[PDB]
Ligand binder design. Structure first.
Ligand SMILES: Nc1ncnc2c1ncn2[C@@H]1O[C@H](COP(=O)(O)OP(=O)(O)NP(=O)(O)O)[C@@H](O)[C@H]1O
Ligand SMILES: [K+]
Ligand SMILES: [K+]
Ligand SMILES: [Mg+2]
Ligand SMILES: [Mg+2]
Length: 318
């Protein structure tokens, strides 16, 4: 921290108390959020921000550099060949991918399966040149349970079938039971503290992303209030995925209100704010028995595609 221009041991002690130890945290901070700190002036604030941006080499990039920035994105396998394919390889770090769908479509199963696959090094796809082994060593996950449906038994079960040690997954997965939107948002914000404490958080799950907001801001005459809170939450999930190069996953519910992308009739809740904020948007449907269909309907560079898979005692497979 003292490498930053206009930063001595005192200011450095103040920056750490305020939770600003990461250079990126500072390079992407505002002179406003920094001044809220004690003896940190406006000039000293702006100087360190410029210093951090610089040290982090945050400027104009072109040519081959653009490809290298993109190479820092590692992906998490979903245990489904078709799904990973449709995903362009797997679940992307530095992005928010949402799985919306009818009850029992397996949104929760996907969140669980992921926490498990995150503990199998061969399920993290990356380019050693851009992403070092250390950066993805001892990966941990954060599961923000919004409805109370986290199931350790399922983690254990899915773990065994993967040939992994269930308890090992439970030991490297933090679970936070959120009872409302306020808790949900604060838990997400405190994920930095888990990292600050040495936890290599590489997976973040918000299940469910919207159920709380919808129950709290029922009268659509407060929809603006909801959209606002929800928008701040989403920005936090996005910045989190970027700075700590981890994958963020969220589940969403669907409403009767139509929205034809084909057969359709339903649509993920959360309105526009969720739509714009989510990097990859899926619609999971149920087929015969344990058959499921995940329909990718929005992403920045991939075409819309359906992926077929199943939910068995093993978790996700095929
Ligand atoms: N141990 C298991 N063995 C086989 N199938 C299972 C097992 N556990 C769960 N399932 C399947 O998973 C389905 C439920 O998946 P789930 O992830 O809860 O869907 P969901 O989208 O999260 N539902 P909801 O949150 O209410 O909208 C069940 O109804 C079972 O068919
Ligand atoms: K249910
Ligand atoms: K549920
Ligand atoms: Mg991103
Ligand atoms: Mg669920």
């Amino acid at each position: 921290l003292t490498d930053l221009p206009g930063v001595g041991p005192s200011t450095a002690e103040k920056l750490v108390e305020a939770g600003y130890i990461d250079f990126m945290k500072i390079a992407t901070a505002t002179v406003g959020e920094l001044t809220d700190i004690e003896g940190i002036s406006e000039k000293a604030a702006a100087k360190m921000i410029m210093g951090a941006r610089d040290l982090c080499d945050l400027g104009f990039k072109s040519g081959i550099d653009l490809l290298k920035q993109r190479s820092t994105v590692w992906k998490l396998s979903t245990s489904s060949s078709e799904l990973d394919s449709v995903l362009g390889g797997g679940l992307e770090s530095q992005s928010v991918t949402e799985f919306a769908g009818v009850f029992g479509s397996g949104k929760t199963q996907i969140m669980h399966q992921s926490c498990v696959n995150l503990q199998n090094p061969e399920f993290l796809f990356y380019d050693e040149e851009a992403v070092s082994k250390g950066e993805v060593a001892q990966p941990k996950a954060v599961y923000i349970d919004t409805e109370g449906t986290f199931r350790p038994e399922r983690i254990m079960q899915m773990a065994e079938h993967a040939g992994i040690d269930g308890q090992t997954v439970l030991d490297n997965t933090f679970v936070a039971r959120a009872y409302n939107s306020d808790m949900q948002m604060l838990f997400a914000e405190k994920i930095e503290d888990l990292i600050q404490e040495g936890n290599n958080i590489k997976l973040v799950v918000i299940d469910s992303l919207t159920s709380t907001f919808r129950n709290e801001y029922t009268g659509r005459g407060k929809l603006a209030e909801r959209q606002q809170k929800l928008g701040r939450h989403m920005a936090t999930l996005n910045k989190l995925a970027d700075l700590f190069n981890c994958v963020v996953l969220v589940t969403n519910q669907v409403s009767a209100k139509p929205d034809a992308f084909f057969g359709m009739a339903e649509q993920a809740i959360g309105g526009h704010i969720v739509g714009h904020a989510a990097t990859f948007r899926f619609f999971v449907r149920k087929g015969k028995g344990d058959k499921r269909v995940a329909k990718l309907y929005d992403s920045p560079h991939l075409p819309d595609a359906e992926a077929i898979f199943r939910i068995t005692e093993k978790g996700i497979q095929d």
